[PDB]
Amino acid sequence: MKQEELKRLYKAQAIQRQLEEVEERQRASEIQGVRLEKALRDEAQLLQEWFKLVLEKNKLMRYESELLIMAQELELEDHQSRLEQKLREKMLKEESQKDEKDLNEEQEVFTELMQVIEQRDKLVDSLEEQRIREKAEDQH
Template sequence: DDPLALLSGSGTLTRRQEKLAKRLSRQAELKRLRMAQEIQRQLEELEVKQKELEERGVAVEKALRGEGNETDNNKEETELMGEWFALVHEKTRLGRYEQELLVRAKELELEDRQARLQQDLRERLTVDDEMKTKDDIEAEREILNEMMEIVEQRDTLLDMMEEDRLRYRSLGHAKTSLEAGPCVRPNAGFWVLVALGVVVVCLSHVLAPLLVHVSR
């Protein structure tokens, strides 16, 4: 990711290097676009699964209160509670999967911004130092600083994913302990927590700008 990797020893790009850099940059843009589209597709599929999960959770709650359909009402309470625990586990798994997708979308956004900064810096470095103004030099310095900030943000995303992985593992242990312990009925309205608004908001605020920029 070195922004100076394609520079010659004299500090200028040869025509061949410049052509290669542009071709590689375009290929990277198309790859990011495909990945962003795939993330969007997976989030849309996740929305459907979460909706189905929510509906089934509500049905199980009603059955536990004796208000479900005939099939569910004929089930033993232990069977219904077992299904409820399974639904809770699936809700947690889907929530973690959603977070992974959104983190990856943010990472793609940072990659796209970094690539544009690199291209801007390459173009600026083709100008001889004698021709640069103080503003030009300051702009180059700001670009380098922003690129360093992006690297730090990407590292932070990786740390977040690791923390989430450890938290998910601990939740798995908690689930096992809970299933082995006393049976507790879920509170009414519990499945409101499976609301889908977060997916819609994140799609519009995270993926949409990236798709617009990369597709240009």
């Protein structure tokens, strides 16, 4: 019995099927590229087909990289959920009652939780760091 960790695994499953659909368009796209190189030898019909292929290849490249992050995001969101729960259980005790080994691992979960949240933020930032160069690339 689960709760809106259900939303997490459905989204995960969706992203993996989206990665698989991209790795097949990537194989398809690269099979065409070798076809048009040999057709290099009107040629306007094939010159614009290879033009479309360049854009298409670049889109799948940008899209794969983003999907891979979205999958790391949900794995971190799941780890955060487990750490947060673990920490709360250790906080149910009153601090007089916890001996020194409690505080050490209670401290440890809290820092691990803060570190999981930091990598969530590093992924958010990296999404912009790659969004900022994509408009430097789309300036053409």
